[PDB]
């Protein structure tokens, strides 16, 4: 019969919560998580010397980065996040701020994650253009990877780009996409949406360009995705859907799209097959 879905955008209530110190500061950002409900605003966090730390060097390299690596319409947004949401090296932008700066933009809005959500949880947020993200910094041992999304992470690779009509519909579209589908058809749309949204590269006036969030806010893997020692591959649902997605390293390989808009039309052929 058909599984339960989120049919508002309040429904999502439902789901979303499905060393020493480091450990009681993650208590913290995961017991606000599970505290927020729908119309809540997102609460603020008073971050530490050593996360602004961390998020000023995270911050300081990718933007010695991004003007030869990022694509055209993450650069284009880039500076409106800057004068309206407090980007800067000494200060880590507030979620609130940035789901009110989204809301204006796209109509995307962020609701605080505690943790990890499964696919389907995940993706039925994007269908009321909702994005969970997590509030917490990486830890400071390792600012250029880390193998678990931060709040750099959502803010520095994702946020850039919900801005962005086209790409904010096409997230969208594969969150409709899979609301109430079938267990199969939600780990190929959660793997198509792997391989563009979080570590997608695109073509633009001929050069290799990347999109993917997972790569924008990763020092050390964004310079690899455009070495380049890295594989690479046309986006194609029926084949890319296959590929297993890696957690704790580098992928393996990485998928380039044509436009947001193709990638749209080429997941739209897709879905209507599966
Ligand atoms: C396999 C799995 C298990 C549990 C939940 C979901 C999945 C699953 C199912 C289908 C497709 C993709 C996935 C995994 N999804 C994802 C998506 N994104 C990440 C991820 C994104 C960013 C980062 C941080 C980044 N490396 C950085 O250094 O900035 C770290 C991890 C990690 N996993
Ligand atoms: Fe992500």
Same mark, same amino acid.
């Given at each position: 019969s058909v599984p339960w879905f989120p /049919? /508002?955008?309040?429904?999502?209530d439902h789901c979303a919560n499905r060393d020493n110190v480091y450990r009681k500061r993650r208590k913290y950002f995961a017991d606000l998580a599970m505290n927020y409900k729908h119309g809540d605003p997102i609460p603020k966090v008073e971050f530490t010397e050593e996360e602004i730390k961390t998020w000023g060097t995270v911050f300081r390299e990718l933007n010695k980065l991004y003007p030869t690596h990022a694509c055209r319409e993450y650069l284009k947004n880039l500076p409106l996040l800057s004068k309206?949401?407090?980007?800067?090296?000494?200060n880590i932008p507030q979620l609130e701020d940035v789901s009110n700066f989204l809301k204006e933009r796209t109509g995307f809005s962020i609701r605080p994650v505690a943790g990890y959500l499964s696919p389907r949880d995940f993706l039925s947020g994007l269908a009321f253009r909702v994005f969970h993200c997590t509030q917490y910094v990486r830890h400071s041992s390792d600012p250029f990877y880390t193998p678990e999304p931060d709040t750099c992470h959502e803010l520095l690779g994702h946020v850039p780009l919900l801005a962005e009509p086209s790409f904010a519909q096409f997230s969208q579209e594969i969150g409709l996409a899979s609301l109430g589908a079938s267990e199969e058809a939600v780990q190929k749309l959660a793997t198509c949406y792997f391989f563009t949204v979080e570590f997608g590269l695109c073509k633009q006036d001929g050069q290799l360009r990347v999109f993917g969030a997972g790569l924008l806010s990763s020092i050390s893997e964004l310079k690899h995705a455009l070495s380049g020692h890295a594989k690479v591959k046309p986006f194609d649902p029926k084949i890319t859907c296959k590929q297993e997605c890696l957690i704790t390293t580098f992928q393996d390989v990485y998928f380039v799209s044509e436009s947001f808009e193709d990638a749209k039309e080429k997941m739209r052929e897709f879905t209507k097959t599966i």
């Open positions: /049919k /508002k955008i309040s429904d999502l309206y949401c407090g980007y800067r090296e000494d």
